[PDB]
Structures are given as structure tokens and as C-alpha cells.
Amino acid sequence: MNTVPFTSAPIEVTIGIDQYSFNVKENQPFHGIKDIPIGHVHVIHFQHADNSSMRYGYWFDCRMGNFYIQYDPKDGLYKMMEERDGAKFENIVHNFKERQMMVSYPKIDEDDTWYNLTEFVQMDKIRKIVRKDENQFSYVDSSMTTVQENELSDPAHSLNYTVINFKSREAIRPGHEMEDFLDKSYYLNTVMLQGIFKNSSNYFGELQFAFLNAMFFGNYGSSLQWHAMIELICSSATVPKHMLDKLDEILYYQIKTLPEQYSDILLNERVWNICLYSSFQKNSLHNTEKIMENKYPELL
């Protein structure tokens, strides 16, 4: 069980760790998060009490290094850093645990929620979407734009999601205009799966990462990407049976986890109505359709 120690907490902040969150007071003797489950990516995230515009965080994987958080009073945020000295780090963590100054990652034994949200998400794929090669962890915030949003301005600070555009030469074979526009199977199976993602696991990983950035940071471009990747499957007549069964499970847990009070801003009425009631796959997402109908019947 891994640990992300904090140097200190000089400013009042709501701290998220995956789907959990807790309030830290200004100069509260808080020195980090312990018992973080090995085997998954994690996200530690922040919303300052004095300024909710500051909404930002770090994707990391404790298998890849020893990470800690330290507040920077110049840049005015909690920063993730890597400690290269194994023995200094172990000695820091042991002291803070002895003095019981760390919150425990509060996982219920029965509860597979985080696995179910991150099943296909891999740090090496995150680091290609979020390019900062000198760090093993990835910073995301509420304001970061996507490569696609920036084409319609700083490229170093962008989310490099795979561009999906239904009215693009990439999406439409010369001479198959109506066929490819009304049935996106070509675009899904040949261009995106075989061509760009190489397999459904990489496709689902990016879809799951987009959803989590939408949910945790209110990142608008991430929300657009999540819905585009759902719509591209639902608008294809020809999808492998395993991919439809897996998508239904993925979306079920995403809709289950979404805070009820954010449904209005995080869910696109048109895409969901089209996907569940009009698309080729309208009858292929049993679990998703039942949770959406019971939790968000107004949207539909």
C-alpha cells in the first residue's frame, strides 16, 4: 500500500483522491494520504477554499516512483514532485505515519468502483495525452484545452486526445459519403481501432480518461471527447460483441459515479438520446439504459 506525503498544507483546500475527498484547514497538520491501492492509476486533486477557479490535479502510479505534494507559494498551488532518494522518502513517510498525520485511502473491501472507472487507463497512455516528459505524473486542470478545441492556443499545455470529427476526410471515404456518414463502422474499426488506437483497450482507456477529467476537473474539452468516443461506437452498425458488452459496463459505472447535481452540465442530451433511443446500438446498452432511465429520466 503506497503513500503520497505532503510537506505541509499552508492553504485551506478540498483534496480529492480518486472518487474520495476531504477538507483540509489552513496550516492544519496534514501530511498526506496512505494505503493507496497498488495496481491502478490514481488522481490527487485540489480545489482551494478561497478560489474555486484553482481546480487541478495529478495523475500518477506509485509503481513508477516516490511522489509527494508540496505547496509552492510563488505559483500558488500544491505541486507533485518525485523524491529520487528511496531512503529519505521511506524515512519521511515512516515519521508521518508514526505521528498519524495521514488520511487513509478509504476503500470499502466490496467496492470495485475505482477499478471499474480505470480498467483500461494506463499511465503510459496518459503521458502521451498530457505531454510533460520530465515528470512521471501528469498535471490536468479545469481550463486546459484539447488539440481539437485549439484548431477551431499554447500547445505545451493542451490535452492531446485523438481528434474525432464526423465531417472530416478521415471519417468519410471518397465515394462512400452517405454510407460512412450514416454508418460510422469504417471510421471506428479501420481508421480508429486498427489504424490509431491499435486495439479496443487503448480506445476505452482514452474514453475513461476523458470522462474522469470531465468529472473531476469540469474540463469541457474532456467532456466533448468522452461523448464523441461514445457516439462513434453507438453510430456504427458493426462493432465487436465484446466491445459493446464492455462499453455498457464502462458507461454504467461512469453514470453510477457521476454526482447527481452535475448531470445537467456533464451529460449531453442529444448524444445520450441518440445513443440509447435512435442509434444502431440503441438496444445493446441494457445496463447503461436502465441506470440512465432511473437516475436521469429528465435528461431523456
Partner: protein
Amino acid sequence: GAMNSSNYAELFNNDIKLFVDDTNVYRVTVHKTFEGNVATKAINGCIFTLNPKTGHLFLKIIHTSVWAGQKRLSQLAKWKTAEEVSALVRSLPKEEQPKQIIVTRKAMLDPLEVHMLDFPNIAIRPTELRLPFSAAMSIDKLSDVVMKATEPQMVLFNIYDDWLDRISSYTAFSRLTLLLRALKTNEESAKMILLSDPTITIKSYHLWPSFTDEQWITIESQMRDLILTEYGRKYNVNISALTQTEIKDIILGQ
């Protein structure tokens, strides 16, 4: 974005543009079967592609063979329209290609945009104008070439005949829209008004009669009265009661 009353002069500037109307592409007669079910029988159709500045009409005849063994024909008709418009643009020399294509029906936007992806600098626009181009098939010579076609055919016409020798494109378009609005509201009455005086003929190379400037004023008046007479006949409205502002508004209204 959308072409409307506010940006009407733009039709007559020097940027090449085409209107595309797809309302006569897929045409059927609905009938009873021997077993008392209902069936459709397709008849020949046409794409109405018009340069409003020059009067140049690209009439692509849609032969019923196009539909043979195809499903969801009203959907296919939009895509076939977009395919043929795309083929027409690619057939034109670069300096003759339109800078904008205005579709008379919003359902044509996605099909045309997808067929014209190769032409990113050609703008595909809807219009807020209610244009009476559906009445094209009430023009005898256009109806005749469509119904006689035995194969796919493109036929080129000038829908203004020689009017541009005497009037501006703005006035020529206004005359065309008034004639087509009249043909659309009461075809019998419109044809009577245009073809009653047998001394005024249609030249072999023209669509409309050879009216003098003064006769066009009389014709145009008779068309506006017909649209009002019919608008009265429709809504049960004493038209002899209406003022000239009241009257002006209803023609443009429609």
C-alpha cells in the same frame, strides 16, 4: 450563416453562388394495389441548381432508374442531390466554381457538406427565404424535358430568358420568385394569366412569353392579385378591404 431578408442583395454581388432545391428530386404517385394496399410509383425528377445573378439553371434530370432496388428513398434523394451538385462543381473550371451554395431545405446541409469536404473554401448555407422553386415543374418546357427523359441527363437553361438585357438581376429574381409563387398557389390561374393573349408567344429558346416592359407590369400586377385572391380564398379574407401596406406584406410574408 443563414441567408435571410437582411442579406438579400448578397444574391446579386460578384461572388459566384448557386441555390440548390431538392424538392422535385424524388417524386411519386401514391396508388391502391389489387389487394387494397397502398404503393408508390416514382416518376422522373430534377435537381434545381440556379445562379441567381446570371439566371443559369443546371437542371439535372433524375431518372426513375436511380431508385431501382434502393431503400429509404427520401433519405437517398438528399445524398444523390449532394452527389450530383458535387459532380457539377468538379465539372466546372476553377474560376466558375461557386464560393457559396445555398440549400433551400436544411436537410440538404449535412449531405452537401459531406460531399464537398474536398472544397473547404465553398460555404454551404441554409436560407430563411421561403423560395417557391418547387413550382419549377409548372414551367411547361422544364416539365416536358424531365418527363420525356429515358436516362440521366443534364439540361442547361437561362431561367430569366433575355430579361437581363433590360433589368437588373435583383429585378429578374423578384419577377421569377413572383411567377413561381403564383404557379405554386394556383397553377391553372397563373398559366391563364401568362398564356391567355395568343399574340404574345414564347420564343423557341425561351421559357416565358416575350412581354414588352409595359406588359410585364400588367402580368406582375395580375400575379400579385392572384396570390392575394388565393390568400383571400384560403383564409376567408375580404381582399377588397385590404390596404397597400397590408397587401405588400402578405406576398413577401409568403
